[PDB]
Amino acid sequence: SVVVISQALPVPTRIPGVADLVGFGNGGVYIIRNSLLIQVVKVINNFGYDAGGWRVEKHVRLLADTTGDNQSDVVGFGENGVWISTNNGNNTFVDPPKMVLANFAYAAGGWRVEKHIRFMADLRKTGRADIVGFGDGGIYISRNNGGGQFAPAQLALNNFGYAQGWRLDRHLRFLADVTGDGLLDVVGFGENQVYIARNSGNGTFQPAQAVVNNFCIGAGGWTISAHPRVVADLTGDRKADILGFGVAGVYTSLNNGNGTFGAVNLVLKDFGVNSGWRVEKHVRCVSSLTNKKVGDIIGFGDAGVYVALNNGNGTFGPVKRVIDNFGYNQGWRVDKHPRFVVDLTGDGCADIVGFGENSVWACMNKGDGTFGPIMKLIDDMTVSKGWTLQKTVRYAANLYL
């Protein structure tokens, strides 16, 4: 697959890759490096609930390469600005973090987790992540000029902001390449249309264009509470398509290749409301599970994990239950046990990792979208070791390649 940044998954992971696990726990930052030694290493005495007073409801914590060396850094949008702990290359990070910009923060700019979105993204092909925020006035960017130097925030576009009516309980915003030039464009599921704003590569986005009159709360009755939507390449040309988990099942609108979109089609009669899928019980993902390197469908359902494989053109094979685990029936809960679909083995076919009640578990893809047995990774970064959704943040992330 390709680099798409979403609200649900603001830290993209590489296909192929051997993703690491990163936890912002009470006591600070801990990593599990993907390797022959599986252990938890504490790396930063900060960015934690107790270590610095970091709060899920006030602050944002991400990973991103802010230097251009393909190593991920820790990035926190704190009370009064943006703090970065850079990767030292050896499973250590700079501590204390450095405050790079007095903006995009609770008390510097009036940023609110419940109103605004903050990402890091290399928006100008410099190799380094710029700060990008969907704020009040529109989209703001702080340019990453290297050496830890971030420029004062500049308005990238006067759209997709709270002022323009954008709401986290109604609407969705993504960064994804819809043209194939490698620049991440805005894709926004608004009140009545899906819009794109083309990335000009210079810290600005072009005027919004409506591309589809569906997939929205006011067009087709798509709600945040029942009908998740994603953007992902379903054909293998590196250009992002639209995919929605609706009522009858999965609908898509395919990119024509130039960032305009096709008609909306029902392509699979599963993974929707009518087949019993529920945002409160289940996790629904699109990731590459095969050597076709396109978006396949993965659902963590009741009885286990279900998969429908993309034929390579956005049509799908039959739904198969591939693992009898990680499901609601096995006690896995959306509010307690983070589950990710990411490559942990370097073959290009995404695997499964789940932060369970007692242990972190993984289940590896055989290379063809079928899976091996469940494997216990470590007894840490779990509910029973004091990690909750309300006080901790957990990601899969490529710290290195």
Interface ranges with Ca ion (CB under 5 A)? 343, 345, 347, 349, 351, 365
| Alpha-carbon gap, residue 295 to 147, rounded angstroms | 36
By the rule CB under 6 A, 316 interacts with ligand SIA: no
How near is the Cβ of 299 to ligand SIA at its closest, in Å? 16
Site string for ligand SIA, 205-244 (x = CB under 6 A): ---x-----x-----xxx----x-----------------
Are 214 and 194 in contact by the 8 Å Cβ rule? The answer is yes
Buried b / exposed e along 63-76 (16+ C-beta atoms within 10 A): bbbbbeeebbbbbb
How near is the Cβ of 19 to ligand SIA at its closest, in Å? 31
Question: 137 contacts which partner out of ligand SIA, Ca ion, none, CB within 5 to 8 A by kind?
Answer: ligand SIA
How near is the Cβ of 56 to ligand SIA at its closest, in Å? 18
Name the residue nearer to Ca ion (CB basis): 301 or 369: 369
Binding residues for ligand SIA restricted to 186-205, rule: CB under 6 A = 190-192
Question: 247 contacts which partner out of Ca ion, ligand SIA, none, CB within 5 to 8 A by kind?
Answer: ligand SIA
Are 132 and 150 in contact by the 8 Å Cβ rule? The answer is no
Q: What number of other Cβ atoms are within 10 A of residue 52's Cβ? A: 19
- Among 367, 342, 369, 366, which residue's Cα sits nearest to residue 353? 342
Are 22 and 64 in contact by the 8 Å Cβ rule? The answer is no
Name the residue nearer to ligand SIA (CB basis): 195 or 332: 195
Return the residue matching tokens 């899969």: 396
Name the residue nearer to ligand SIA (CB basis): 153 or 307: 153
- Apex CA 216: angle with CA 215 and CA 222, to 5°? 80
Please report, for residues 52, 92, 139, the alpha-carbon distance to residue 190 in angstroms, rounded to integers and kept in the order given: 36, 41, 15
How near is the Cβ of 353 to ligand SIA at its closest, in Å? 30
Residues 10, 282, 55, 92: is their CA dihedral positive or negative?
negative
Instruction: Answer whether the bond into residue 10 is a cis peptide, omega within 30°.
Output: no
Name the residue nearer to ligand SIA (CB basis): 164 or 345: 164
| Alpha-carbon gap, residue 120 to 129, rounded angstroms | 5
How near is the Cβ of 3 to ligand SIA at its closest, in Å? 24
Are 310 and 295 in contact by the 8 Å Cβ rule? The answer is yes
> With left for phi above 0 and alpha for psi between -120 and 50, is residue 161 left, alpha or beta?
beta
Question: 171 contacts which partner out of ligand SIA, Ca ion, none, CB within 5 to 8 A by kind?
Answer: ligand SIA
How near is the Cβ of 363 to ligand SIA at its closest, in Å? 30
Name the residue nearer to Ca ion (CB basis): 192 or 370: 370
Question: 59 contacts which partner out of Ca ion, ligand SIA, none, CB within 5 to 8 A by kind?
Answer: none
By the rule CB under 6 A, 264 interacts with ligand SIA: yes
How near is the Cβ of 216 to ligand SIA at its closest, in Å? 8
Give the number of residues in contact with ligand SIA, rule: CB under 6 A.
29
Name the residue nearer to ligand SIA (CB basis): 38 or 108: 108
How near is the Cβ of 213 to ligand SIA at its closest, in Å? 8
| Alpha-carbon gap, residue 76 to 71, rounded angstroms | 16
Residue 90: partners with Cβ closer than 8 Å, 6 or more residues away: none
Question: 401 contacts which partner out of ligand SIA, Ca ion, none, CB within 5 to 8 A by kind?
Answer: none
Question: 13 contacts which partner out of ligand SIA, Ca ion, none, CB within 5 to 8 A by kind?
Answer: none
By the rule CB under 6 A, 251 interacts with ligand SIA: yes
DSSP 302-342: SSSEEEE-B-SSS-B---EEEES-SSGGGT--TTT--EEEE
Contacting residue, 24, 77, 83, 111, with ligand SIA by CB under 6 A: 111
Please report, for residues 180, 227, 233, the alpha-carbon distance to residue 253 in angstroms, rounded to integers and kept in the order given: 17, 15, 11
How near is the Cβ of 223 to ligand SIA at its closest, in Å? 8
| Alpha-carbon gap, residue 114 to 117, rounded angstroms | 8
By the rule CB under 6 A, 153 interacts with ligand SIA: yes
Residues 23, 52, 401, 122: is their CA dihedral positive or negative?
positive
Q: By CB under 6 A, which span of 7-15, 24-32, 184-192, 357-365 interacts with ligand SIA?
A: 184-192
Name the residue nearer to Ca ion (CB basis): 20 or 351: 351
Q: By CB under 6 A, which span of 132-140, 295-303, 317-325, 390-398 interacts with ligand SIA?
A: 132-140
